[PDB]
Amino acid sequence: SAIPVHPTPASVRLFEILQGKYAYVQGQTIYANLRNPGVFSRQVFTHLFKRAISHCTYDDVLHDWNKFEACIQKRWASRFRESTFESWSTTMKLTVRDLLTTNIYRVLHSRSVLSYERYVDWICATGMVPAVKKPITQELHSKIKSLRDHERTIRSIGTELYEATKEIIESLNSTFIPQFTEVTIEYLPRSDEYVAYYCGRRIRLHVLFPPAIFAGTVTFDSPVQRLYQNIFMCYRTLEHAKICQLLNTAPLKAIVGDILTGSTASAIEKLFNSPSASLGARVSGHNESILNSFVSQYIPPSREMTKDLTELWESELFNTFKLTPVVRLYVRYSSDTISILLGPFTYLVAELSPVELVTDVYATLGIVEIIDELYRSSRLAIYIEDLGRK
Amino acid sequence: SAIPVHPTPASVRLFEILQGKYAYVQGQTIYANLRNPGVFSRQVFTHLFKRAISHCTYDDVLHDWNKFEACIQKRWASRFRESTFESWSTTMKLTVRDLLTTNIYRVLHSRSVLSYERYVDWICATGMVPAVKKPITQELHSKIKSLRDHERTIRSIGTELYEATKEIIESLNSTFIPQFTEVTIEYLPRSDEYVAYYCGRRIRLHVLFPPAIFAGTVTFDSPVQRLYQNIFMCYRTLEHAKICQLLNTAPLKAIVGDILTGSTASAIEKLFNSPSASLGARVSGHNESILNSFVSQYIPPSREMTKDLTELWESELFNTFKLTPVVRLYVRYSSDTISILLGPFTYLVAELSPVELVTDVYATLGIVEIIDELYRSSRLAIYIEDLGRK
Amino acid sequence: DILTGSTASAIEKLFNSPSASLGARVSGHNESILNSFVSQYIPP
């Protein structure tokens, strides 16, 4: 009256292939390229930054420029203004850049419970994602006070940033994805749905590509499910090649009825006497007689299979996710893989309603130009140019 | 008096070939490139956006520019206007861009019942499409209220967007395409038509390429139906190659009448004694005698077949759908595949009467320039230029 | 069970099947063979 899905041997083997146990080949090492936390943290960095600079207005900047110019002029005529302005501008830019990033980094690289890497291992090789709601403890609640630790245009930004970082913490520390064991998924024929059990308790479960069930089996809609059949035809011949090599090693055959770095004169006297120096085969049912016999060596070709799997992996992962190589030197996210892999994670699993998705160009640049670009098209930037041209 | 079509073994095998069970080759991994949801969601994004900006008029923009310029001038002579205008313009552009996309994305990436991917699996390998009408529940009806949660030119856009997103939701959540099982298709000779049964009930069924029936069989008009004959001639020789390799493995033959990572000195002593070290063949009807005998090894060529299927797949899918590669690096939709695969889905299956089809250029660009282009040729854009040149 | 198998039972199964030899008989119950040959030809 209920058929099991996840704790099945086929599924666990499908999971172990991802760790690398059966036939690891030079093509599979692209999987660890869309698995880095990476891009995710490049998205958060953009929401906190933006928000902050969105607070300044046309009043405080005007008043502060008034005060600063007044002070410098009080210190000690068509060139004076143009000479003093280009210092104030750069000073403001660098003070903002020094204020924000050192606080953002601590929030990024600290400990968290929600792990992006345990999300991809569920999409590939299964198709569906379990989740668990967790209560926010006070041991992280006390960290908010530690997080709490003349120009007004800086005085506001601090508070808005303090408030923006408030919600993201309580959101990042409230969902837990049990990695591989102790989670059970099951199918119910009557009123057909899918259920999930975590240490004897019903929890959430999101389905993205329903596995077809033809009353005998289960088959997922997963990039690994398709390659499951070639990988084993390769791993079962790597194991036969070796059986063929360990039999064509005796120097002479018949039909009957301390070494790597050694002394090279004792090694030989040792090997010439071992029982690994001949081979004796007997074929007789105690009454039969042999009528002919032959000999030859055959060694299956095991070095071309592993040259095919490389292209197979590279193509099956370049198509299904739309990764674009640059020239091969560097492989990176493209505006399509962003959507497919971060839609159902930002808006569906995590309750990160205000966060957008990251632009395709902000996903492969360095930070030095990301800071510049974000500072360029922000409301603070366009007021200073208005101030410059009187 | 009625001949069955779908639950037939031939058909189910034709369906399983698409999942990858018989001979998966490097060419087949183009099929998963026209199967992504992808382009479909790039179409919706264009109808909601456009509609919204279509609402503004020549009145509100004029009055709001009046108010804004009045305020800024009240703050504190041929350069003043030209200096203040280029700030208002960009401010309006970015506020619109920040308003619309964050609401569109939530509607796009949320849950829905109508699945584009279960449409292609019906076109290819069968030719016809079943469908089921579903009632719109109230659990999504309550989500419309959650969806409900100074310049007038923003105040209108919000309402028109709220109304545009209204109909698309109730349209997207009202059609269900049963994937593979529990749907039965049948042919009636008298008054010849095609009928569909879903858990004991007649439903819709759309035919796009009628299968020819020559009174013995059924044959669909499907790209997989043609390749059905080569795929099996290949998969039935991959299985014979292996039978030939597992017989040419004994080191010596006659005619009668813990290993991969081991100790390399115990492995040998184990293998030299196993019954896998010889081969004994007997050919005698208890009274016959052998008159001659020979020996040789033949291993069928199984590495060139799978080099032919690759080109066969690539061509059979490049021609039948008109996909254009860019240089191979990237494969993408072309103005012809758009028509052939999204006509009968937007206007025939789904009742999406107002939606157009997507332009061939808006289907391979990123979002950063799509937003720009859509904002360029819209009625709002052409009023601001009119305002600029007095 | 052959393509993805145990490679130690597959062999013990194949070595005993009747697909391991070939026996040809050419005699009209009274004829005798005078010579014989062997070769493989695979059409292009």
Coordinates of N, CA and C in Angstrom, one line a residue, chain B residues 124-298:
Chain B
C124 N 7.7 14.4 -29.8 CA 8.6 13.4 -30.2 C 8.2 12.1 -29.6
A125 N 8.3 11.0 -30.4 CA 8.0 9.6 -30.1 C 6.5 9.3 -30.1
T126 N 5.6 10.3 -30.2 CA 4.3 9.9 -30.5 C 3.6 10.7 -31.6
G127 N 3.6 12.0 -31.5 CA 3.0 12.8 -32.5 C 1.7 13.5 -32.0
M128 N 1.1 13.0 -30.9 CA -0.2 13.5 -30.4 C -0.1 13.8 -28.9
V129 N -1.0 14.7 -28.4 CA -0.9 15.3 -27.1 C -2.2 15.1 -26.4
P130 N -2.2 14.4 -25.2 CA -3.4 14.4 -24.4 C -3.3 15.6 -23.4
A131 N -4.5 15.9 -22.9 CA -4.6 17.0 -21.9 C -5.8 16.7 -21.0
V132 N -5.9 17.4 -19.9 CA -6.9 17.2 -18.9 C -7.2 18.6 -18.3
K133 N -8.5 18.9 -18.2 CA -9.0 20.2 -17.6 C -9.1 20.0 -16.1
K134 N -8.5 20.9 -15.3 CA -8.5 20.8 -13.9 C -9.2 22.1 -13.3
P135 N -9.9 21.9 -12.2 CA -10.5 23.1 -11.5 C -9.5 23.8 -10.6
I136 N -9.6 25.1 -10.6 CA -8.7 26.0 -9.9 C -9.0 26.0 -8.5
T137 N -8.2 25.5 -7.6 CA -8.5 25.4 -6.2 C -8.4 26.8 -5.5
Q138 N -8.8 26.8 -4.3 CA -8.8 28.1 -3.5 C -7.4 28.3 -2.8
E139 N -6.6 27.2 -2.7 CA -5.3 27.3 -2.0 C -4.4 28.2 -2.9
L140 N -4.5 28.2 -4.2 CA -3.9 29.2 -5.0 C -4.7 30.5 -5.1
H141 N -6.0 30.5 -4.9 CA -6.8 31.7 -4.9 C -6.5 32.6 -3.8
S142 N -6.1 32.1 -2.6 CA -5.6 32.9 -1.5 C -4.3 33.5 -1.8
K143 N -3.5 32.9 -2.7 CA -2.2 33.5 -3.0 C -2.3 34.8 -3.8
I144 N -3.5 35.1 -4.4 CA -3.7 36.3 -5.1 C -3.7 37.5 -4.1
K145 N -4.1 37.3 -2.9 CA -4.1 38.4 -1.9 C -2.6 38.7 -1.5
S146 N -1.8 37.6 -1.3 CA -0.4 37.8 -1.0 C 0.3 38.5 -2.2
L147 N -0.2 38.2 -3.4 CA 0.3 38.9 -4.6 C -0.1 40.4 -4.6
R148 N -1.3 40.7 -4.0 CA -1.6 42.1 -3.8 C -0.6 42.9 -3.0
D149 N 0.0 42.2 -2.1 CA 1.1 42.8 -1.3 C 2.4 42.6 -2.0
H150 N 5.3 58.5 -4.6 CA 4.4 59.6 -4.7 C 4.0 60.0 -6.1
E151 N 4.9 59.7 -7.0 CA 4.7 60.0 -8.4 C 3.5 59.1 -8.9
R152 N 2.6 59.7 -9.7 CA 1.5 58.9 -10.2 C 1.9 57.9 -11.3
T153 N 2.9 58.3 -12.1 CA 3.4 57.4 -13.1 C 3.9 56.1 -12.6
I154 N 4.0 55.9 -11.3 CA 4.3 54.6 -10.7 C 3.0 54.0 -10.2
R155 N 2.1 54.9 -9.7 CA 0.9 54.5 -9.1 C 0.0 53.7 -10.0
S156 N 0.0 54.1 -11.3 CA -0.8 53.3 -12.3 C -0.2 52.0 -12.6
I157 N 1.1 52.0 -12.9 CA 1.8 50.8 -13.4 C 1.5 49.6 -12.4
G158 N 1.6 49.9 -11.1 CA 1.3 48.9 -10.2 C 0.0 48.2 -10.4
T159 N -1.1 49.0 -10.7 CA -2.4 48.4 -10.8 C -2.5 47.6 -12.1
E160 N -2.0 48.1 -13.2 CA -2.1 47.4 -14.5 C -1.3 46.1 -14.4
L161 N -0.1 46.1 -13.7 CA 0.6 44.9 -13.6 C -0.1 43.9 -12.7
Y162 N -0.8 44.4 -11.6 CA -1.6 43.5 -10.8 C -2.7 42.9 -11.5
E163 N -3.3 43.6 -12.5 CA -4.4 43.0 -13.3 C -3.8 42.1 -14.3
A164 N -2.7 42.4 -14.9 CA -2.1 41.5 -16.0 C -1.7 40.2 -15.4
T165 N -1.1 40.2 -14.2 CA -0.7 38.9 -13.6 C -1.9 38.1 -13.1
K166 N -3.1 38.7 -13.1 CA -4.2 38.0 -12.6 C -4.6 36.9 -13.5
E167 N -4.8 37.1 -14.8 CA -5.3 36.1 -15.7 C -4.3 35.0 -16.0
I168 N -3.0 35.3 -16.0 CA -2.0 34.3 -16.4 C -1.9 33.3 -15.3
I169 N -2.2 33.6 -14.0 CA -2.1 32.6 -13.0 C -3.3 31.6 -13.1
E170 N -4.5 32.1 -13.2 CA -5.6 31.2 -13.4 C -5.5 30.4 -14.7
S171 N -4.8 30.9 -15.7 CA -4.6 30.1 -16.9 C -3.5 29.1 -16.8
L172 N -2.5 29.4 -16.1 CA -1.4 28.4 -15.9 C -1.7 27.3 -15.0
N173 N -2.7 27.4 -14.2 CA -3.0 26.4 -13.1 C -4.3 25.7 -13.4
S174 N -4.6 25.4 -14.7 CA -5.8 24.8 -15.1 C -5.7 23.7 -16.1
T175 N -4.5 23.3 -16.5 CA -4.3 22.3 -17.5 C -3.2 21.3 -17.0
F176 N -3.5 20.0 -17.1 CA -2.6 19.0 -16.5 C -2.3 18.0 -17.6
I177 N -1.1 17.6 -17.8 CA -0.7 16.7 -18.9 C -0.2 15.4 -18.2
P178 N -1.0 14.4 -18.2 CA -0.5 13.1 -17.5 C 0.7 12.6 -18.2
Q179 N 1.8 12.3 -17.5 CA 3.1 12.2 -18.1 C 3.1 11.0 -19.1
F180 N 2.9 9.8 -18.5 CA 3.3 8.6 -19.3 C 2.4 7.4 -19.1
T181 N 1.9 7.2 -17.9 CA 1.0 6.1 -17.6 C -0.4 6.6 -17.4
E182 N -1.3 5.6 -17.1 CA -2.7 5.9 -16.7 C -3.4 6.8 -17.7
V183 N -2.9 6.9 -18.9 CA -3.6 7.6 -20.1 C -3.6 6.6 -21.2
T184 N -4.8 6.4 -21.8 CA -5.0 5.4 -22.8 C -5.6 6.0 -24.1
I185 N -5.0 5.7 -25.2 CA -5.4 6.3 -26.5 C -5.9 5.1 -27.3
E186 N -7.0 5.4 -28.1 CA -7.6 4.3 -28.8 C -8.1 4.8 -30.1
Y187 N -8.3 3.9 -31.1 CA -8.7 4.2 -32.4 C -10.0 3.4 -32.7
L188 N -11.0 4.1 -33.3 CA -12.3 3.6 -33.7 C -12.5 3.6 -35.2
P189 N -12.7 2.4 -35.8 CA -12.8 2.4 -37.2 C -14.0 3.0 -37.8
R190 N -15.2 2.7 -37.2 CA -16.4 3.4 -37.6 C -16.4 4.8 -37.2
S191 N -16.6 5.7 -38.1 CA -16.5 7.2 -37.8 C -15.2 7.5 -37.2
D192 N -14.1 7.2 -37.9 CA -12.8 7.1 -37.4 C -12.3 8.4 -36.7
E193 N -12.0 8.2 -35.4 CA -11.5 9.3 -34.6 C -10.5 8.7 -33.6
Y194 N -10.0 9.5 -32.7 CA -9.1 9.0 -31.6 C -9.6 9.4 -30.3
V195 N -9.6 8.5 -29.3 CA -10.2 8.8 -28.0 C -9.2 8.6 -26.9
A196 N -9.4 9.2 -25.8 CA -8.4 9.2 -24.7 C -9.1 9.0 -23.4
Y197 N -8.6 8.1 -22.5 CA -9.2 7.7 -21.3 C -8.2 8.0 -20.1
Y198 N -8.7 8.7 -19.1 CA -7.9 9.1 -18.0 C -8.7 8.6 -16.7
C199 N -8.2 7.5 -16.1 CA -8.9 6.9 -15.0 C -10.4 6.8 -15.2
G200 N -10.8 6.2 -16.3 CA -12.2 6.0 -16.7 C -12.9 7.3 -16.9
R201 N -12.5 8.1 -17.9 CA -13.2 9.3 -18.3 C -12.6 9.8 -19.6
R202 N -13.5 10.3 -20.5 CA -13.1 10.9 -21.7 C -12.5 12.3 -21.5
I203 N -11.4 12.6 -22.2 CA -10.7 13.9 -22.1 C -10.4 14.4 -23.5
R204 N -9.7 15.5 -23.5 CA -9.2 16.1 -24.8 C -8.1 15.2 -25.4
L205 N -7.9 15.4 -26.7 CA -6.7 14.8 -27.3 C -6.5 15.6 -28.6
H206 N -5.3 16.1 -28.8 CA -4.9 16.9 -30.0 C -4.0 16.0 -30.8
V207 N -4.3 16.0 -32.1 CA -3.5 15.2 -33.1 C -2.7 16.2 -34.0
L208 N -1.4 16.0 -34.2 CA -0.6 16.9 -35.0 C 0.0 16.2 -36.2
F209 N 0.2 14.9 -36.2 CA 0.7 14.1 -37.3 C 0.0 12.7 -37.2
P210 N -1.1 12.5 -37.9 CA -1.8 11.2 -37.7 C -1.0 10.0 -38.1
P211 N -0.9 9.0 -37.2 CA -0.2 7.8 -37.5 C -0.8 7.0 -38.5
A212 N -0.1 6.6 -39.5 CA -0.6 5.7 -40.6 C -0.9 4.3 -40.0
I213 N -2.0 3.8 -40.4 CA -2.5 2.5 -39.9 C -2.8 1.6 -41.1
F214 N -1.9 0.6 -41.3 CA -2.1 -0.3 -42.5 C -2.7 -1.6 -42.1
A215 N -3.6 -1.6 -41.1 CA -4.5 -2.7 -40.8 C -3.7 -3.9 -40.1
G216 N -2.4 -3.8 -40.0 CA -1.7 -4.7 -39.2 C -1.0 -4.0 -38.1
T217 N -0.5 -2.8 -38.3 CA 0.3 -2.1 -37.3 C -0.1 -0.7 -37.1
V218 N 0.7 0.0 -36.3 CA 0.6 1.4 -36.1 C 2.0 2.0 -36.2
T219 N 2.2 3.1 -36.9 CA 3.5 3.8 -37.0 C 3.3 5.3 -36.9
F220 N 4.0 5.9 -36.0 CA 3.8 7.3 -35.7 C 4.7 8.1 -36.7
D221 N 4.4 9.4 -36.7 CA 5.2 10.3 -37.5 C 6.1 11.1 -36.6
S222 N 7.1 10.4 -36.0 CA 7.9 10.9 -35.0 C 9.4 10.7 -35.2
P223 N 10.2 11.7 -35.0 CA 11.7 11.6 -35.2 C 12.3 10.4 -34.5
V224 N 11.7 9.9 -33.5 CA 12.2 8.7 -32.8 C 11.8 7.4 -33.6
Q225 N 10.6 7.4 -34.2 CA 10.1 6.3 -34.9 C 11.1 5.8 -36.0
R226 N 11.7 6.8 -36.7 CA 12.6 6.5 -37.8 C 13.9 5.9 -37.3
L227 N 14.5 6.5 -36.2 CA 15.8 6.0 -35.7 C 15.6 4.7 -34.9
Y228 N 14.3 4.3 -34.6 CA 14.1 3.1 -33.9 C 14.8 1.9 -34.4
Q229 N 15.1 1.9 -35.7 CA 15.7 0.7 -36.3 C 17.2 0.6 -36.2
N230 N 17.9 1.8 -36.3 CA 19.3 1.8 -36.1 C 19.7 1.6 -34.7
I231 N 19.0 2.3 -33.8 CA 19.3 2.2 -32.4 C 19.4 0.7 -31.9
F232 N 18.5 -0.1 -32.4 CA 18.5 -1.5 -31.9 C 19.6 -2.3 -32.6
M233 N 19.9 -2.0 -33.9 CA 21.0 -2.7 -34.5 C 22.3 -2.4 -33.8
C234 N 22.4 -1.2 -33.2 CA 23.6 -0.9 -32.4 C 23.6 -1.5 -31.0
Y235 N 22.5 -1.5 -30.3 CA 22.4 -2.0 -29.0 C 22.5 -3.6 -29.0
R236 N 22.2 -4.2 -30.1 CA 22.3 -5.6 -30.2 C 23.7 -6.1 -30.6
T237 N 24.6 -5.2 -31.0 CA 26.0 -5.6 -31.2 C 26.9 -5.2 -30.1
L238 N 26.6 -4.1 -29.4 CA 27.3 -3.8 -28.1 C 27.1 -5.0 -27.2
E239 N 26.1 -5.8 -27.3 CA 25.9 -6.9 -26.4 C 26.6 -8.2 -26.9
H240 N 26.9 -8.2 -28.2 CA 27.6 -9.3 -28.8 C 29.1 -9.2 -28.7
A241 N 29.6 -7.9 -28.8 CA 31.0 -7.7 -28.5 C 31.5 -8.3 -27.2
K242 N 30.7 -8.0 -26.1 CA 31.0 -8.5 -24.8 C 31.0 -10.0 -24.7
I243 N 30.1 -10.6 -25.4 CA 30.1 -12.1 -25.4 C 31.3 -12.6 -26.1
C244 N 31.9 -11.9 -27.1 CA 33.1 -12.4 -27.7 C 34.3 -12.1 -26.8
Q245 N 34.3 -11.1 -26.0 CA 35.5 -10.8 -25.2 C 35.6 -11.7 -24.0
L246 N 34.5 -12.2 -23.5 CA 34.5 -13.0 -22.3 C 34.8 -14.5 -22.6
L247 N 35.0 -14.8 -23.9 CA 35.4 -16.1 -24.3 C 36.9 -16.2 -24.8
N248 N 37.4 -15.1 -25.3 CA 38.8 -15.0 -25.6 C 39.6 -14.4 -24.4
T249 N 39.5 -15.1 -23.2 CA 40.2 -14.7 -22.0 C 41.0 -15.7 -21.4
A250 N 40.7 -17.0 -21.5 CA 41.5 -18.1 -21.0 C 42.9 -18.0 -21.7
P251 N 44.0 -18.2 -20.9 CA 45.3 -18.0 -21.6 C 45.5 -19.2 -22.5
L252 N 45.0 -20.4 -22.3 CA 45.2 -21.5 -23.2 C 43.9 -22.3 -23.3
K253 N 43.7 -22.8 -24.6 CA 42.4 -23.4 -24.9 C 42.7 -24.8 -25.4
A254 N 41.7 -25.7 -25.4 CA 41.9 -27.1 -25.8 C 40.6 -27.6 -26.4
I255 N 40.6 -28.9 -26.8 CA 39.5 -29.5 -27.4 C 39.5 -31.0 -26.9
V256 N 38.5 -31.4 -26.2 CA 38.5 -32.6 -25.4 C 37.6 -33.6 -26.1
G257 N 37.6 -34.9 -25.6 CA 36.8 -35.9 -26.1 C 36.2 -36.8 -25.1
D258 N 40.1 -6.0 -3.8 CA 41.0 -7.1 -3.5 C 41.8 -7.6 -4.7
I259 N 41.4 -7.1 -5.9 CA 42.1 -7.4 -7.1 C 42.6 -6.1 -7.8
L260 N 41.8 -5.0 -7.8 CA 42.2 -3.8 -8.4 C 43.3 -3.1 -7.5
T261 N 43.2 -3.2 -6.2 CA 44.1 -2.6 -5.3 C 44.4 -3.7 -4.2
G262 N 45.4 -4.6 -4.6 CA 45.7 -5.8 -3.7 C 47.1 -5.9 -3.5
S263 N 47.6 -7.1 -3.3 CA 48.9 -7.4 -2.9 C 49.8 -7.9 -4.0
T264 N 49.3 -8.3 -5.2 CA 50.0 -8.5 -6.4 C 50.9 -9.8 -6.3
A265 N 51.0 -10.3 -5.1 CA 51.6 -11.6 -4.9 C 50.6 -12.7 -4.4
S266 N 49.6 -12.3 -3.7 CA 48.5 -13.1 -3.4 C 47.4 -13.2 -4.4
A267 N 47.2 -12.0 -5.1 CA 46.2 -12.0 -6.2 C 46.6 -13.1 -7.3
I268 N 47.9 -13.2 -7.6 CA 48.4 -14.1 -8.6 C 48.2 -15.5 -8.1
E269 N 48.6 -15.8 -6.9 CA 48.4 -17.2 -6.3 C 46.9 -17.6 -6.2
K270 N 46.0 -16.6 -6.2 CA 44.6 -16.9 -6.2 C 44.1 -17.1 -7.6
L271 N 44.5 -16.3 -8.5 CA 44.0 -16.4 -9.9 C 44.5 -17.7 -10.6
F272 N 45.8 -18.1 -10.3 CA 46.3 -19.2 -11.0 C 45.7 -20.5 -10.6
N273 N 44.8 -20.6 -9.6 CA 44.1 -21.8 -9.3 C 42.6 -21.8 -9.5
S274 N 42.0 -20.7 -9.9 CA 40.6 -20.6 -10.2 C 40.3 -21.4 -11.4
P275 N 39.0 -21.7 -11.5 CA 38.5 -22.4 -12.8 C 38.4 -21.5 -14.0
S276 N 38.9 -20.3 -13.9 CA 38.8 -19.3 -15.0 C 40.2 -19.3 -15.8
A277 N 41.0 -20.3 -15.7 CA 42.3 -20.4 -16.2 C 42.4 -21.2 -17.5
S278 N 41.4 -21.9 -17.9 CA 41.4 -22.7 -19.1 C 40.1 -22.7 -19.8
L279 N 39.9 -23.6 -20.8 CA 38.6 -23.7 -21.5 C 38.6 -25.1 -22.1
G280 N 37.5 -25.8 -21.8 CA 37.4 -27.1 -22.4 C 36.1 -27.3 -23.2
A281 N 36.3 -27.5 -24.5 CA 35.1 -27.7 -25.4 C 35.0 -29.1 -25.8
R282 N 33.8 -29.6 -25.8 CA 33.5 -31.0 -26.2 C 32.5 -31.0 -27.3
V283 N 32.8 -31.7 -28.4 CA 31.9 -31.8 -29.6 C 31.8 -33.2 -30.0
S284 N 30.9 -33.9 -29.6 CA 30.7 -35.4 -29.9 C 29.3 -35.9 -29.5
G285 N 28.7 -36.5 -30.5 CA 27.4 -37.1 -30.2 C 27.5 -38.5 -29.7
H286 N 28.5 -38.7 -28.8 CA 28.8 -39.9 -28.1 C 29.3 -41.0 -29.0
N287 N 29.3 -40.7 -30.3 CA 29.8 -41.7 -31.3 C 30.6 -41.0 -32.4
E288 N 30.6 -39.7 -32.5 CA 31.3 -39.0 -33.6 C 32.8 -38.9 -33.3
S289 N 33.5 -38.6 -34.3 CA 35.0 -38.3 -34.2 C 35.3 -37.0 -34.9
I290 N 36.3 -36.3 -34.3 CA 36.7 -35.0 -34.9 C 37.7 -35.3 -36.0
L291 N 37.6 -34.5 -37.1 CA 38.4 -34.7 -38.3 C 39.4 -33.6 -38.5
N292 N 39.0 -32.3 -38.1 CA 40.0 -31.3 -38.1 C 39.5 -30.2 -37.1
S293 N 40.3 -29.2 -36.9 CA 40.0 -28.2 -35.9 C 41.0 -27.0 -36.1
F294 N 40.6 -25.8 -35.6 CA 41.3 -24.6 -35.9 C 41.1 -23.7 -34.7
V295 N 41.6 -22.5 -34.8 CA 41.4 -21.5 -33.8 C 41.7 -20.1 -34.3
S296 N 40.9 -19.1 -33.8 CA 41.2 -17.8 -34.1 C 40.3 -16.9 -33.2
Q297 N 40.7 -15.6 -33.1 CA 39.9 -14.7 -32.3 C 39.3 -13.7 -33.3
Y298 N 38.0 -13.4 -33.2 CA 37.3 -12.4 -33.9 C 36.5 -11.5 -32.9

